[PDB]
């Protein structure tokens, strides 16, 4: 059907439109203007409009008649998510009003904000609504509503209006917003909700203790759709509920909602209903357009949110349960199905039970399959502190949850491991050759028919993404065209070979839905389109630069083919548990590690492969200052029926040890078996359970390897501290006190992380082969400690020792700790001993130990009949993967430089250094002081890094190199600048030894990039010796390597010219003005300093404006270092502080080749805008700009002379830009110099500079009108006036404000005398006057008047089209057009303009210009000046200068920081007094409304409907006529009553006189009166001129009885018939009762008088009926003709 197709097309349109960022706050402004209703229902109505957007409701004032004119603009300022805003509904609703009753509904249109967002420009324009009644919907239309509504986001602008004389004001089907094919259709979504599983405990569990712990939740589903909330039934005490309820969602098709929000709630009787979790159906993702309606399911949707552990206290992460944030734990899953049923709109049973045959259908989507998951933990590095022991728990869904103690021991977690210092900064878990192994078994639906397709399309997209990265690197590197064509042919053949992939056959699979068939059909269509376009492109196209736009479109289409809403597999969540508490999480999608039998590509990207994931703290959007751990893990997921295929993915030998414990005790100096009381001699690890050596047997698939052996060597075998060559030791020191007492040395005055006392620093000695770097130890300052290096903690019972520390001392603290460091360069009888049995045994006996024990362990090896797959058959054993050999590597990181770093000191700079970390190794770069753009120029070498696994597995997945940038501070702790994560270039042999390429990787702090760092790395597999490694880089300091020659950017000699023009807006520094500044420009280690300004207040510009330095700069434009600008204020006692700095990193713009009817102003304005025309008299126009003059792209922002860079000072807070303390005005020209001085230098680029002295300027600000201001009063209007600040002078106009309009017509010139450039900042503000209260600011704009003065485009005065010396268009510039042509010839280096002997030709710019080339086809009226100036001006108009313009300047405000608060049509002329006085100013004073008189006479009435009963008691009518103009309610007049009419006929011969003010140029009238009696100032209305004539039954002693009306718009008055018998209905338009026809119209203002018969009407049951006929003559006279022939 066409309805299903158009729903699919509209949902794909909203699919393409919904692509912006999901910022939960975002500032939006929605304007809704109603203009004019046409043909509203009822008779003698008093209509009114109420518009409801986002809860806010505005209200029009009361108008009259069946064709009301409102022209009222409403504003809606909301702050919400864009996706939530575009699901909101705008509800326009027309009411009738009464004098003694409330409002009655008469029409309603509903339209969502999303579709008016999808319109180009985010704003529908003067479109007509089809009003309909929600309960009287069978009657069709009720009226029409011309509205225009706008949506403005951050940076968005409304589109300009267009001319409306004949296209928009008439006929309404020419501008319908929606066509008639919609036919008020409803769309019904049957969101069936079957059941849910694994809902966590959300009740108190104390009631069941008194009286079952698995089912402590009372769930129900909240379905939010289009603002309506439908709640399902509540299932009491069931964690696996079964609702089985269809939710009958409904939307009328003009207003659709896209985001169905399902939110399971735990119902609480006494408290608020808690949130279980929130998932969404996106209707645009489950619908397409051939196409199909929204279909989904039956498929489980997984919920995510807070951790599942119940706390009676408020949990800190309930914001994750509401769908905000990504969610850190599995909260259950809900089985839903979506079906779309067009029409049939059933209002009964919004909740309907599931029919009993759908419960048989849904059984086949509920079948479970066994899944086996393995995870081999390779390396857990970048740990910030050791703390307690650290454990990793793997869980998919609720399977493998360690805190679910009600189940059996799951063995889904690693052993507790204690972190080891890597020698420089970080910590790592010491796994080495024995990686931990986690295995767990889950049960999910076999949805491989989805996930093979998802994984294969993802592999397609990743291959094509790699190929387009190769292509963009090829075209960026300027590699030769043959290799580029070969690489492009490789790309196209990759597409051809890939997209002949047949998607998996849905027939035969159990869990195939209707949506699965539709997505498979869509994917086959898309893949066939991509394959055939590839076979077209491989033979047709020849150029790759045209085709990358199509190839990126293929990448976009392929990445939209991987969208799978029916992914029922929950994510694998890996939790780091420090101590007993959850710390950090990561979510791996289950399809990324899932194994399929269909091949490699159908398996996941990381299926059986080691991937690097960074854990996050549970409510962080990204990593902040502290990454908790960087974890490399080898995850393989798959079906347990094919778990034998894990053998091909496994590496190493999996190993589980059976264990036994034997205990002994010491009496009389001899160890023996005596005294083993309370714990068994042969027992477990705790000693409570008696065990034997014969109690352990291998399970199925396992066999013994070797014999039982003693295992005491696990202390020595943990990596032997041999992987480092430069180290830093650490020894901790402790003190203790009572609360409130004095400090003293502790019971354990030196400790380590294990929890007991350690050796003093005087006892520490080096290992053999090592020596000390420093002579003595020192205490740590660079942590969260005080001045002496101490942190403080507390002991709380029942714990005896502290577990946390803070930076400051409080009175309740009982302990303290200090770290001591020093750099470094270059017994075992088989038992562990302790003081008690079952105590803390340690490998060496102390004086207090009288007990001992040992381990008796035997190895199990997997059998050959099972392979490594036997680890899944362990249904506790602890599995660990042993690697039989190690591979030695060698990493070199070329940290070259950084740019645009954050300022984190008070002296406006930083001291950045970098921690380079890679696995269990770390090193620190040098500290570069007092800069934000450091050049470390340093190579960081980690020789002999031990990486386990095959070298190919390192090649496919390199471990990440992580750089953390820190601002060094001499006191306090060093602050975090950002973090860059990148992959090294792995090399395994001498073939792949190509040199690495430096790249600008981003430096992410939080969620934003806070600079870029130029860094690369290479990771070389070390051979038999270090001979295969390249040579060491040359040192410049001891153990300080430079970046080598092949990696370093190749530098050339390059000039940088700096046009230091001047400094603007210099804010005070240290409560002193910037009196003697200077400029310092640093680039590439060289600096240049300008001359010192002796007084900034006197001279704001540098005395010599050109600086010059020779710098070595990279040849490649990518590698170009930033340009640093500082401002140094020179003060007393020789002090030179820095008072401002900017970083300019985009220098590609700076590189250049050095060898390269009444006549006034408003008639002109209305002729240019388009609102006896003015162009017929031959006069000129002006150029109306819809934006600012700086925002016009042709004038380059009016910064062609010099750009402007904001200067910043001090430490920046919340990672944004720092405080702006001014602006440096200048520009740069960068060009490569010749290498040797025999070649002459290139010419300088700054020669034609103007004079930098201050100049006095006469500035004329002509402000024309304001457009759509923000309302600042209670009535929705504003009383605007103009407040101009220009340096010191303020001209406010509060006594000449314009009363109560949102579209003011100012028409006022404000002339000032200011000194440029000290007063360059021209601030024009519109302010709302108030009678008693404070004045609000509507808006604000800034014009750089020096940019107007100094630009080459002549923006100081716009050149008009004609040179007139008199009239209203007199030449307002100071200089004649010959002098402007002289000036532009002098600027451009052209020869000066040569005037001929008669002024007909001018030689300029190498061309001949003549008078007859421009003066032809024009009327040369009398105001034209000298013809040589006309021809010079005609030359000047073609030179790209600023024309005579009215720019539209956006009024910005702090109410909404980048949303237009209105617009201000205006222009500014700057007239510098050195060039002479200007001409006469333009009189832009708005024209008065010229008076008009409307006169009618009423001849007769015929076939009027007779009144049914008069007062006298007869079928008898008292016919008489009222008449008025809308707006003029006070000017109502009525005729005499034609008494005793028994035939519907009546003669009046009565005269009406209707004075009204008119604007012929705007084609509308002015009526002025107060809104009410207590109005401060009278208001003005702008409504089109029209006449309401009305016919009435008198009833002199009774009520007035309405009979009919007739409306004649005086510009479009319909042509009357010449007789009452030819007069009939439907010669006037009608759009509701019958299929419409065009009428015949004539203007009464032009055709001044005509006489005839007119039809008048009323309506009943929505259909027009004739109330009668009336004869009249309508005439319009002006003011003087009303006095020439007056009338009564
Ligand atoms: C006798 C029992 C009266 C119980 C009265 C009562 O209504 O208590 C409500 C609270 C919290 O109960 P909720 O299920 O809302 O917790 C949900 C949770 N905040 C969440 O957000 O997940 O109970 C307790 O703190 C336990 C007190 C036990 C006192 C013995
Ligand atoms: C009794 C009025 C108390 C004042 C509150 C009020 O509603 O004033 C109405 C008007 C204009 O509105 P405000 O700008 O004050 O409030 C709008 C608000 N600032 C905003 O930004 O939305 O204020 C007057 O001085 C005229 C008083 C006429 C009294 C006859
Ligand atoms: Ca509860
Ligand atoms: Ca409950
Ligand atoms: Ca509650
Ligand atoms: Ca600092
Ligand atoms: Ca510092
Ligand atoms: Ca106000
Ligand atoms: Ca006001
Ligand atoms: Ca106010
Ligand atoms: Ca009557
Ligand atoms: Ca009557």
UniProtKB/Swiss-Prot annotation:
Modification sites for N6-acetyllysine: 350, 681, 1211
Cellular localisation: Cell membrane; Nucleus membrane; Cytoplasmic vesicle membrane
Residue span(s) of domain C2: 10-129, 168-289, 876-1001, 1032-1156, 1240-1358, 1476-1624
Residues involved in Ca(2+) 1 binding: 212, 218, 266, 268
Alphabetized GO MF terms: calcium ion binding; phospholipid binding
A GO CC annotation given for this chain: cytoplasmic vesicle
Tissue: Expressed in myoblast and endothelial cells (at protein level). Highly expressed in cardiac and skeletal muscles. Also present in lung, and at very low levels in kidney, placenta and brain.
Protein name (record): Myoferlin
Organism: Homo sapiens
Source taxonomy: Eukaryota, Metazoa, Chordata, Craniata, Vertebrata
Gene (UniProt): MYOF
């Amino acid at each position: 059907t066409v309805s299903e197709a158009q729903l699919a097309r509209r949902l794909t349109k909203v699919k393409n439109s919904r692509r912006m960022l999901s910022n939960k706050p975002q500032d939006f402004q929605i304007r809704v203007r109603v203009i004019e209703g046409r043909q509203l229902s009822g008779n003698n109505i008093r209509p009114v409009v109420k518009v409801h957007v986002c809860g806010q409701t505005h209200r029009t004032r009361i108008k009259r008649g069946n064709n009301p004119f409102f022209d009222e603009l409403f504003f809606y300022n909301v702050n919400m998510t864009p996706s939530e805003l575009m699901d909101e509904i705008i509800s326009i609703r027309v009411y009738n009003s009464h004098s003694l009753r409330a409002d009655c509904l008469m029409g309603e249109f509903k339209i969502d904000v999303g579709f008016v967002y999808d319109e180009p420009g985010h704003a529908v324009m003067r479109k007509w609504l089809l009003l309909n009644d929600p309960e009287d919907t069978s009657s069709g239309s009720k009226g029409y509503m011309k509205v225009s509504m706008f949506v403005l986001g951050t940076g968005d602008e409304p589109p300009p209006e267009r001319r409306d004389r004949d296209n928009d004001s008439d006929d309404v089907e020419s501008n319908l917003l929606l066509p008639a094919g919609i036919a008020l259709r409803w769309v019904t979504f049957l969101l069936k909700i079957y059941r849910a599983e694994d809902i966590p405990q959300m009740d108190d569990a104390f009631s069941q203790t008194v009286k079952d712990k698995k089912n402590l939740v009372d769930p129900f589903v909240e379905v939010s759709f289009a603002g309506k909330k439908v709640c399902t039934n509540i299932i009491e005490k069931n964690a696996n509920p079964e609702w089985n309820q269809v939710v009958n969602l409904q939307i009328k098709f003009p207003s659709v909602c896209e985001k169905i929000k399902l939110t399971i709630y735990d119902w609480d009787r006494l408290t608020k209903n808690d949130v279980v979790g929130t998932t969404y159906l996106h209707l645009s993702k489950i619908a397409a357009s051939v196409g199909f309606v929204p279909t989904f399911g039956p498929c489980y949707l997984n919920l995510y949110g807070s951790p599942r552990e119940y706390t009676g206290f408020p949990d800190p992460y309930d914001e994750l349960n509401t769908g905000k944030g990504e969610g850190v734990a599995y909260r259950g899953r809900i089985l839903v199905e979506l079906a779309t049923f067009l029409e049939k709109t059933p209002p009964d049973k919004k909740l309907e039970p599931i029919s009993n045959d759908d419960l048989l259908v849904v059984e086949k989507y509920q079948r479970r399959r066994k899944y086996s998951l393995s995870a081999v933990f390779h390396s857990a590095t970048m740990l910030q502190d050791v703390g307690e022991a650290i454990q990793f728990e793997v869980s998919i869904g609720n399977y493998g949850n360690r805190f679910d103690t009600t189940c059996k021991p799951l063995a889904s977690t690693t052993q507790y491991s204690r972190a080891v210092f890597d020698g420089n900064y970080y910590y790592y878990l010491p796994w080495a050759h024995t990686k931990p192994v986690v295995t767990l078994t889950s049960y999910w639906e076999d949805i491989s028919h989805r996930l093979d397709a998802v994984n294969t399309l993802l592999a397609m997209a990743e291959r094509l993404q790699t190929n387009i990265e190769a292509l963009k690197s090829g075209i960026q590197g300027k590699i030769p065209a043959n290799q580029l064509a070969e690489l492009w042919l490789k790309l196209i053949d990759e597409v051809i070979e890939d997209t002949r992939y047949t998607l998996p056959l849905t027939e035969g699979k159990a869990n195939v839905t209707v949506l699965d068939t539709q997505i498979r059909k869509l994917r086959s269509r898309s893949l066939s389109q991509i394959h055939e376009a590839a076979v077209r492109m491989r033979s047709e196209a020849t150029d790759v630069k045209s085709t990358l736009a199509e190839i990126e479109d293929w990448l976009d289409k392929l990445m939209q083919l991987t969208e799978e809403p029916q992914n029922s597999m929950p994510d694998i969540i890996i939790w780091m548990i420090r101590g007993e508490k959850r710390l950090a999480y990561a979510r791996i999608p289950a399809h990324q590690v899932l194994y399929s039998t269909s091949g490699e590509n159908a398996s996941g990207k990381y299926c059986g492969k080691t991937q690097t994931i960074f854990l996050k703290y549970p409510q962080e959007k990204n990593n902040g200052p502290k990454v908790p751990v960087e974890l490399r893990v080898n995850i393989w997921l798959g079906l347990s029926a094919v778990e034998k295929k894990f053998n091909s993915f496994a590496e190493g030998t999996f190993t589980v040890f059976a264990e036994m414990y034997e205990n002994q005790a010491l009496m009389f100096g001899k160890w023996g078996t005596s005294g083993l009381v309370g714990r068994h001699k042969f027992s477990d690890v705790t000693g409570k359970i008696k065990l034997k050596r014969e109690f352990f047997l291998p399970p199925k698939g396992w066999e013994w390897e070797g014999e039982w052996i003693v295992d005491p060597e696990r202390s020595l075998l943990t990596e032997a501290d041999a992987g480092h060559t430069e180290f830093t030791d650490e020894v901790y020191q402790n003190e203790s006190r009572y609360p409130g007492g004095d400090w003293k040395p502790a019971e354990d005055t030196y400790t380590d992380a294990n929890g007991d006392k350690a050796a003093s620093p005087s006892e520490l000695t080096c290992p053999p082969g090592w020596e000390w770097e420093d002579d003595a130890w020192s205490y740590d300052i660079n942590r969260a400690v005080d001045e002496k290096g101490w942190e403080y903690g507390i002991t709380i019972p029942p714990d005896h020792k502290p577990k946390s520390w803070v930076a400051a001392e409080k009175m309740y603290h009982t302990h303290r700790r200090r770290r001591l460091v020093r750099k470094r360069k270059k017994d075992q009888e088989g038992w562990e001993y302790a003081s008690l049995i079952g105590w803390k045994f340690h490998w060496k006996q102390r004086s207090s130990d009288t007990f001992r024990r040992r381990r008796w362990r035997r190895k199990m090896a997997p059998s050959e009949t099972h392979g490594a797959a036997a680890i899944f058959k362990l249904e506790t054993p602890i599995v660990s993967c042993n690697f039989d050999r190690v591979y030695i590597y060698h990493l070199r990181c070329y940290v070259y430089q950084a740019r645009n770093l954050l300022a984190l000191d008070k002296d406006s700079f930083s001291d950045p250094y970098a921690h380079i970390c890679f696995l269990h190794r770390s090193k620190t770069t040098e500290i570069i002081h007092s800069t934000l753009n450091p050049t470390w120029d340093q190579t960081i070498i980690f020789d002999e890094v031990e990486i386990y696994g095959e070298p190919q597995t390192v090649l496919q997945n390199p471990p990440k190199v992580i750089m953390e940038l820190f601002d060094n501070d001499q006191v306090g702790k060093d602050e975090f600048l950002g973090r860059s994560i990148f992959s090294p270039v792995v090399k395994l042999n001498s073939e792949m030894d190509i040199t690495p390429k430096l790249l600008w990787h981003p430096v992410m702090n939080g969620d934003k990039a806070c600079g870029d760092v130029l860094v690369t790395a290479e990771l070389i597999l070390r051979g038999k010796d270090g001979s295969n490694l390249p040579i060491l880089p040359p040192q410049r300091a001891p153990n300080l390597y430079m970046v080598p020659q092949g990696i370093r950017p190749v530098v050339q000699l390059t000039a940088i010219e700096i046009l230091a023009w001047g400094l603007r807006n210099m804010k005070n520094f240290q409560m002193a003005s910037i009196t003697s500044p200077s400029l310092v420009v640093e680039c590439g280690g060289e600096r240049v300093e300008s001359v010192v300004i002796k007084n900034l207040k006197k001279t704001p510009n540098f005395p010599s404006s050109v600086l010059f330095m020779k710098v070595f700069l990279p040849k490649e434009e990518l590698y170009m270092p930033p340009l640093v600008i500082k401002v140094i204020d020179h003060r007393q006692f020789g002090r030179k502080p820095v008072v401002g700095q900017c970083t300019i990193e985009r220098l590609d713009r700076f590189r250049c080749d050095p060898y390269a009817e009444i006549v006034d102003w408003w008639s002109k304005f209305y002729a240019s805008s388009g609102e006896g025309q003015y162009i017929q008299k031959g006069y000129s126009k002006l150029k109306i700009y819809n934006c600012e003059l700086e925002n016009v792209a042709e004038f380059e922002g009016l910064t062609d002379f010099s750009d402007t860079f904001k200067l910043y000072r001090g430490k920046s807070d919340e990672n944004e830009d720092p405080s702006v303390v001014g602006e440096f005005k200048g520009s740069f020209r960068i060009y490569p110099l010749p290498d040797d001085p025999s070649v002459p230098a290139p010419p300088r680029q700054f020669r034609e500079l103007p004079d930098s002295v201050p100049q006095e300027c006469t500035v004329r600000i002509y402000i024309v009108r304001g457009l759509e201001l923000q309302p600042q009063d209670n009535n929705g209007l504003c009383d605007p006036y103009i407040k101009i600040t220009l340096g010191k002078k303020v001209i406010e106009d509060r006594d000449h404000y314009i009363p109560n309009t949102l579209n003011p017509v100012f028409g006022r010139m404000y002339e000032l005398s200011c000194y440029l450039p000290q007063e360059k900042d021209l601030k024009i503000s519109v302010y709302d006057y108030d009678t008693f209260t404070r004045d609000e600011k509507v808006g604000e704009t800034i014009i750089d008047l020096e940019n107007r003065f100094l630009s080459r485009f002549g923006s100081h005065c716009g050149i008009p089209e004609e040179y007139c010396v008199s009239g209203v268009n007199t030449w307002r510039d100071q200089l004649r057009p010959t002098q402007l042509l002289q000036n532009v010839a002098r600027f451009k280096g052209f020869p000066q303009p040569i005037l001929s002997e008669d002024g007909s030709r001018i030689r300029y710019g190498g061309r001949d210009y003549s008078l007859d080339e421009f003066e032809a086809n024009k009327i040369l009226h009398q105001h034209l000046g000298a013809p040589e100036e006309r021809l010079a001006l005609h030359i000047l108009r073609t030179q790209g200068l600023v024309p005579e313009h009215v720019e539209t300047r956006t009024l910005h405000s702090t109410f909404q920081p980048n949303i237009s608060q209105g617009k201000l049509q205006m222009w500014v002329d700057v007239f510098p007094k050195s060039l002479g006085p200007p001409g006469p100013p333009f009189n832009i004073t708005p024209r008065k409304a010229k008076k008009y008189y409307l006169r009618v006479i009423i001849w007769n009435t015929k076939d009027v409907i007779l009144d049914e009963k008069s007062i006298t008691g007869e079928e008898m009518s008292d016919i008489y006529v009222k008449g008025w103009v809308p707006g003029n309610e006070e000017n109502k007049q009525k005729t005499d009553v034609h008494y005793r009419s028994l035939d519907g006929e009546g003669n009046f011969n009565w005269r009406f006189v209707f004075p009204f003010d008119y604007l012929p140029a705007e084609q509308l009238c002015i009526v002025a009166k107060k809104e009410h009696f207590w109005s401060i100032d009278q208001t003005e209305f702008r409504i089109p001129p029209r006449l309401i004539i009305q016919i009435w039954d008198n009833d002199k002693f009774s009520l007035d009885d309405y009979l009919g009306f007739l409306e004649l718009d005086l510009r479009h008055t319909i042509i009357p018939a010449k007789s009452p018998e030819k007069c009939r209905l439907d010669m006037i338009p009608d759009l509701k009762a019958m299929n419409p026809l065009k009428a015949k119209t004539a203007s009464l203002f032009e055709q001044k008088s005509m006489k005839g018969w007119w039809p008048c009407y009323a309506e009943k049951d929505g259909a027009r009926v004739m109330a009668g006929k009336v004869e009249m003559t309508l005439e319009i006279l002006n003011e003087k003709e009303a006095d020439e022939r007056p009338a009564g």
